Amino acid sequence: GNTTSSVILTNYMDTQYYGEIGIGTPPQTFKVVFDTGSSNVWVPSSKCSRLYTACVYHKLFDASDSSSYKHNGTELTLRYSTGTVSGFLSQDIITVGGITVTQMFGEVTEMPALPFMLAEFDGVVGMGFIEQAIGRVTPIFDNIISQGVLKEDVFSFYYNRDSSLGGQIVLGGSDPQHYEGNFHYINLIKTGVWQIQMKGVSVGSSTLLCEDGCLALVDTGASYISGSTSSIEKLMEALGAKKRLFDYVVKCNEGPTLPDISFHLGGKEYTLTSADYVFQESYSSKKLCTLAIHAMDIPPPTGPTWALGATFIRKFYTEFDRRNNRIGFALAR
Amino acid sequence: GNTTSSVILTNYMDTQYYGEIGIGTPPQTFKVVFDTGSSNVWVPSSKCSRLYTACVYHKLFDASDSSSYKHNGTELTLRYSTGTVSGFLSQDIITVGGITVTQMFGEVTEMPALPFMLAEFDGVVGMGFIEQAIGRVTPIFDNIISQGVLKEDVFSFYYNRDSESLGGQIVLGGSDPQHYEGNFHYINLIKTGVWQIQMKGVSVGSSTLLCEDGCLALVDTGASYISGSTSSIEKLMEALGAKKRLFDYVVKCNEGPTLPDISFHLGGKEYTLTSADYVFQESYSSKKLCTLAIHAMDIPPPTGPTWALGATFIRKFYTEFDRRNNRIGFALAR
Numbered sequence: 001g002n003t004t005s006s007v008i009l010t011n012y013m014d015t016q017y018y019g020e021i022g023i024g025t026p027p028q029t030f031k032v033v034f035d036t037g038s039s040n041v042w043v044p045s046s047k048c049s050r051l052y053t054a055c056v057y058h059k060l061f062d063a064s065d066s067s068s069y070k071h072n073g074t075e076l077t078l079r080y081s082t083g084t085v086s087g088f089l090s091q092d093i094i095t096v097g098g099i100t101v102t103q104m105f106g107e108v109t110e111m112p113a114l115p116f117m118l119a120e121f122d123g124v125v126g127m128g129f130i131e132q133a134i135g136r137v138t139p140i141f142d143n144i145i146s147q148g149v150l151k152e153d154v155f156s157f158y159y160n161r162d163s164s165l166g167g168q169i170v171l172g173g174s175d176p177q178h179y180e181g182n183f184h185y186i187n188l189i190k191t192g193v194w195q196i197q198m199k200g201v202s203v204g205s206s207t208l209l210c211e212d213g214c215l216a217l218v219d220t221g222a223s224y225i226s227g228s229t230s231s232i233e234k235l236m237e238a239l240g241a242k243k244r245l246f247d248y249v250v251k252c253n254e255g256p257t258l259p260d261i262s263f264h265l266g267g268k269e270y271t272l273t274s275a276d277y278v279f280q281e282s283y284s285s286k287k288l289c290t291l292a293i294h295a296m297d298i299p300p301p302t303g304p305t306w307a308l309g310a311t312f313i314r315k316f317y318t319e320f321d322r323r324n325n326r327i328g329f330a331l332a333r
Numbered sequence: 334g335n336t337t338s339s340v341i342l343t344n345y346m347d348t349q350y351y352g353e354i355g356i357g358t359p360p361q362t363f364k365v366v367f368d369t370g371s372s373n374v375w376v377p378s379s380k381c382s383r384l385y386t387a388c389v390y391h392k393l394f395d396a397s398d399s400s401s402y403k404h405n406g407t408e409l410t411l412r413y414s415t416g417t418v419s420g421f422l423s424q425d426i427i428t429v430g431g432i433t434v435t436q437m438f439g440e441v442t443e444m445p446a447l448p449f450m451l452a453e454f455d456g457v458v459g460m461g462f463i464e465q466a467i468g469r470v471t472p473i474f475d476n477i478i479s480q481g482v483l484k485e486d487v488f489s490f491y492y493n494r495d496s497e498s499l500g501g502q503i504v505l506g507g508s509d510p511q512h513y514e515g516n517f518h519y520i521n522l523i524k525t526g527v528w529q530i531q532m533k534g535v536s537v538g539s540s541t542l543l544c545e546d547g548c549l550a551l552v553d554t555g556a557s558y559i560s561g562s563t564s565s566i567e568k569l570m571e572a573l574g575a576k577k578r579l580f581d582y583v584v585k586c587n588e589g590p591t592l593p594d595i596s597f598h599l600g601g602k603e604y605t606l607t608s609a610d611y612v613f614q615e616s617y618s619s620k621k622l623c624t625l626a627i628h629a630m631d632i633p634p635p636t637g638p639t640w641a642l643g644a645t646f647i648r649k650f651y652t653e654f655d656r657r658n659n660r661i662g663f664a665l666a667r
């Protein structure tokens with residue numbers, strides 16, 4: 001086709017990026033995170049029990065208000081790293097940017113306040129592949145492509161830094177106003193996960209980590225750049241970061257002193273400077289600053305793997321190419 | 334005709350959108366707000382006393398340096414919701430977006446420091462109907478239509494989000510598809526003479542708690558905010574738990590991200606704003622106040638009482654002002 005659809009995102013604290021979708025006729029509007037690490041669509045239910053606060057605190061779909069809903073009941077449990085959610089299939093019209101599409105989505109009838117009570121958004125739009133879809137339900141993007149319509153079989157993510165639009169997704173292309181120069185692509189290790197091969201992680205001038213290769217999931221639904229507990233321990237130790245109770249911290253004044261961290265992908269070096277990975281809330285010698293890199297031991301089959309989340313995307317605008325099973329990166333602007 | 338002209342705009346702090354016009358021979362350049370809520374053109378005059386500080390800080394039209402000027406001199410006063418300007422009429426050639434028109438405009442000689450010292454712009458280009466023109470002067474758009482150059486008898490507005498980007502864009506005689514998506518949905522004007530439509534109701538969250546029974550919505554490009562009657566606002570705000578200040582309402586910064594959506598029921602479609610769209614989020618602190626870009630303004634009859642949908646709304650929905658067919662169309666902005 002010859003269209004593109006974009007969704008303006010809200011950037012909450014550099015940790016949550018979400019946009020609007022409407023579900024049903026007329027549409028009921030929800031805030032969703034668009035997640036490449038998963039493939040299901042889900043929102044909180046009409047029918048959610050109001051005990052778990054999450055539902056009491058989220059917008060709930062009311063199928064009784066949809067002129068276009070179509071009953072489905074097949075039950076679902078959606079398991080992510082942070083948590084799990086349960087509900088059941090439903091069939092309705094979803095508006096995304098300027099596109100309307102019929103979609104099987106999950107009606108979230110069980111939704112735990114950990115982490116759900118921390119979510120500034122209502123639900124999730126999985127931008128992952130069918131192979132990861134609970135219920136082997138056709139993922140929204142796939143459904144949108146069926147539609148002809150989009151110019152290219154691709155979708156792009158822009159995440160801004162918290163200070164402006166908070167971010168933007170473009171379905172069917174990329175927006176040149178938000179990147180510099182040209183994309184360089186890295187091919188997926190295999191169809192089914194948005195995961196590529198990584199040939200090294202350098203601290204400053206030196207390959208400290210992943211010397212003999214590793215995996216990197218490009219995850220729009222993850223806040224930080226993460227690696228296993230061991231990798232991160234090693235990385236932090238190279239940075240001189242210490243763990244302050246819950247997290248790794250640095251003296252805020254010495255943040256501008258930390259080395260660059262480079263990620264070797266597709267034969268290039270994707271470099272983040274300390275300003276790109278240190279939360280410089282402050283610059284005092286009297287305060288401790290947090291880092292936007294965390295350990296995350298991801299289970300196989302997917303893991304162990306590094307996850308390149310918002311911290312990475314902020315630096316590199318990203319294009320997910322379905323057609324060619326590759327990811328394109330360009331300097332965000 | 335087959336022409337379409339666009340005016341690039343500057344976005345100052347999400348509250349003032351303006352562009353440039355040239356008046357006179359040679360051209361004397363001014364920043365102006367293009368206002369659908371009024372129909373006169375005006376800029377500050379070189380005849381404005383310097384005892385008016387706003388005239389000391391603004392670009393001044395000097396008829397004596399213009400060889401195309403035509404004297405008129407009739408007096409006029411222009412009353413806006415937030416201030417008033419006074420002066421006299423002149424005639425000159427004005428260029429706007431590459432279009433040149435001979436236009437009667439006001440040379441302002443009295444320009445209050447409050448609010449004008451706070452304007453980044455110099456003057457105003459009213460985009461309304463002659464029905465609203467002070468001094469019966471013909472509005473710019475009518476003069477431009479008279480030329481037979483525009484592809485269509487419509488003008489469209491794009492207002493961007495601020496930036497750290499194009500601040501905005503006005504298209505004369507069309508729309509720019511680069512700036513909207515999906516389709517336009519239209520509401521016929523209650524009447525010609527005013528860019529005001531019927532509004533079916535107002536929801537805070539889901540609860541149509543406002544405008545049950547109908548109300549009016551003035552689609553105002555010269556308005557920074559979305560506004561309703563003081564009583565409307567007191568109720569709206571009640572629901573948001575925002576505190577009333579002198580000129581605005583506030584919420585505790587931390588509360589901001591969690592405010593409910595606000596819907597506007599117009600012609601058929603619901604126009605939904607999220608808190609991110611109407612709160613000025615400038616921190617997430619517990620001990621800091623965050624303004625809302627929804628205000629109370631009681632506009633007098635005959636136009637009011639009405640809600641005014643200004644920049645808060647337009648940022649999210651691209652707007653087309655259809656003269657030919659007396660209607661306004663909205664589309665999702667991009």
Ligand SMILES: CC(C)C[C@H](O)[C@H](O)[C@H](CC1CCCCC1)NC(=O)[C@H](CC1CC1)C[C@H](O)[C@@H](O)Cc1ccccc1
Nearest residue numbers: 033035037080081082115116118119221222223296302307
């Ligand atoms: C292969 C898997 C690692 C993919 C992973 O499940 C999906 O990307 C999943 C999608 C999120 C979307 C927001 C709601 C919770 C699920 N991300 C993840 O769980 C991320 C960590 C995975 C190691 C990478 C956690 C996310 O950063 C999570 O904190 C976002 C959140 C914020 C506030 C409340 C709840 C959740």
Ligand SMILES: CC(C)C[C@H](O)[C@H](O)[C@H](CC1CCCCC1)NC(=O)[C@H](CC1CC1)C[C@H](O)[C@@H](O)Cc1ccccc1
Nearest residue numbers: 366368370413414415448451452553555556557630632641
């Ligand atoms: C029928 C009326 C409601 C129409 C209304 O007077 C016009 O739209 C008028 C046009 C402006 C143009 C800039 C110079 C001041 C007048 N907008 C208004 O006054 C608006 C409130 C009306 C309830 C809608 C607020 C305006 O946006 C005002 O904040 C802009 C301003 C900023 C800084 C300094 C001076 C002015």
Ligand SMILES: *[C@@H]1O[C@H](CO)[C@@H](O)[C@H](O)[C@H]1NC(C)=O
Nearest residue numbers: 071072073074089104135137
């Ligand atoms: C619900 O959808 C699932 C998966 O598409 C399907 O296999 C099941 O038959 C559906 N139920 C109904 C009401 O047909």
Ligand SMILES: *[C@@H]1O[C@H](CO)[C@@H](O)[C@H](O)[C@H]1NC(C)=O
Nearest residue numbers: 404405406407422437469470
């Ligand atoms: C001023 O302009 C009005 C409108 O054209 C005109 O009718 C009036 O005669 C003019 N007055 C003078 C003194 O030029």
